Amino acid sequence: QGITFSKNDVEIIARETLYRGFFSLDLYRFRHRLFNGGMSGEITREIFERGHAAVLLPFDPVRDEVVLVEQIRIAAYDTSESPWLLEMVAGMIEAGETVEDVARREALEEAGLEVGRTKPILSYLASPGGTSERLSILVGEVDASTAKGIHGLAEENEDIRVHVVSREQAYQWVEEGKIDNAASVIALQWLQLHYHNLRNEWTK
Amino acid sequence: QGITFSKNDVEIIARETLYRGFFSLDLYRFRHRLFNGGMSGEITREIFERGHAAVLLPFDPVRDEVVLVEQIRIAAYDTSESPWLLEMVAGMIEAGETVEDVARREALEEAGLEVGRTKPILSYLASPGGTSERLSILVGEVDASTAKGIHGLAEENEDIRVHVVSREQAYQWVEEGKIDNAASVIALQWLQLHYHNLRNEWTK
Ligand SMILES: O=P(O)(O)OC[C@H]1O[C@H](O)[C@H](O)[C@@H]1O
Ligand SMILES: O=P(O)(O)OC[C@H]1O[C@H](O)[C@H](O)[C@@H]1O
Ligand SMILES: [Mg+2]
Ligand SMILES: [Mg+2]
């Protein structure tokens, strides 16, 4: 069971930069094995390269509360009622950094939060038909009573508002489409599947 | 409660397409309201633009099985053990098409599956800090005993293998990281939260 082929079955011949900016768009040229037994010809695909991210679900297990951060995401504009989204704390992982380093730095910069214990949730590919981006989600223990106000680095043109909701209310917002970005959906569905054991572990 | 600002609170000054090929790399220039009052200066953001997608989770409620499709996604290569991924059926929504029409068409083209009833799951933004892409997921009733074979438009360099597994195995693969693309994680977490009611609904 499971997948059929490995890295032994594909050769990346070359990569070419198509667009070089803050982010990049690359052309990968490659050949690969086929399910019918043969080899493909040389194929090309465009791939959006923007690095990889750490995501933190800030969960208060005592109060059963979740911290959300609100900020504009202009890319949401064309398909959303508003480009301001309710999200998990998140940021890019720089060379040599750990997921936890980033999650803790972003929790402070974006939400004013200290973080206690942490556990992995999931690491996922955002949209692997067109981008390499991987996001690694942690749940972090927080005191939601300390989560409030406006944060973000104005030097980065980052303007962020903290919201505190109950876990049930956050999940209701997913169901209703009020929270509709992948990282937050994945994190909050995970929390609905795991909260009983997580709260027991963190309130012993 | 919820979000603070609407489309009246942002002015998109300019959009430019800096790269156009299979996909597009756009630049948005805009100003927006700030939480503490007033307006930002002009902000520029690069946005990966690839249109929007329909996704179908093929679920057999009699058998408690899901149908997965396997194909190479070279963008996964740098952060994954193999670039062949296990995924939901999916494809682009063209002008004036509905999510449901596309989902039903792709289930036949990618997996050879006829679909019975459908229900919405969720519609999400894949990674809204850098891409506009929205994906809308349905669950689709299938007879998984009919799911077999190799599919794809070879003229479009598309090579796809169909797998049938129990829902429980598919979900355990999410937990283990063997299924780790956003659309499949979201769909299978949703299924884990909803399958009991869905099976009752679809096996009357
Ligand atoms: O199956 P394709 O038509 O290549 O692409 C459909 C979607 O599934 C893949 O993850 C892509 O990134 C898209 O979001
Ligand atoms: O908060 P940022 O540093 O802008 O970006 C972190 C992640 O959250 C946003 O959806 C982006 O697309 C990334 O995937
Ligand atoms: Mg951030
Ligand atoms: Mg497809």
Domain ranges of chain A: 7-49, 53-202
Here the tokens at position B84 are 């062949």
Of A150, A159, A185, the CB nearest to B124: A185
Of B34, B70, B183, the CB nearest to A159: B34
Question: Which residue of chain B has the CA closest to A9?
Answer: B82
Binding residues of B for Mg(2+): 90, 106, 110, 156, 158
Q: Where are the beta strands (DSSP E) in chain B?
A: 10-20, 24-32, 43-49, 53-60, 65-72, 84-87, 89-92, 118-125, 134-141, 150-151, 160-166
Measure the CA–CA gap between B164 and B161, rounded to whole angstroms.
10
Helical residues (DSSP H) of B91-181, grouped into ranges? 99-111, 167-176
Binding residues of B for AMP: 46, 73, 129, 156
Check: CATH 3.90.79.10 for A53-202? yes
Please tell me the distance in Å from A37's CA to the nearest CA on chain B.
11
Dihedral sign (CA A134, A140, A144, A146): negative
- What residues have CB less than 8 Å from B76, skipping those under 6 apart? A125, A128, A132, B82, B83, B85, B181
Measure the CA–CA gap between A99 and B189, rounded to whole angstroms.
23
Here the tokens at position A64 are 């059963």
Nearest by Cα to B46 from B129, B141, B134 = B129
Burial class (CB in 10 A: 0-12, 13-18, 19+), B96: exposed
What are the CA-CA distances from residue B2 to residues A1, A74, A173, B122 (Å)?
44, 18, 9, 19
Query: Which residue in the block uniquely carries the two structure tokens 């074979």?
Result: B149
Q: Which residues of B touch A37 (CB under 8 A)?
A: none
Contact yes or no for A40 and B157 at CB 8 A: yes
Nearest by Cα to B42 from A90, A152, A74 = A74
Burial class (CB in 10 A: 0-12, 13-18, 19+), B83: buried
Query: Which residue in the block uniquely carries the two structure tokens 């959009």?
Result: B15
Beta bridge partners of A45: A28
Give me the amino acid identity at A83. P
Q: Do B47 and B28 meet the contact criterion of CB atoms below 8 Å apart?
A: yes
Residue A156 is a catalytic residue: yes
Structure method? X-ray
Measure the CA–CA gap between B46 and B42, rounded to whole angstroms.
14
| CB contact A130 to B (< 8 Å) | yes
Helix (H, G, I), strand (E, B) or coil at A141: strand
Phi/psi at B174 (5° precision): -60, -50
Nearest by Cα to B103 from B84, B120, B126 = B120
Q: Do A7 and B88 meet the contact criterion of CB atoms below 8 Å apart?
A: no
Q: Do B21 and A46 meet the contact criterion of CB atoms below 8 Å apart?
A: yes
| CB contact A108 to B (< 8 Å) | no
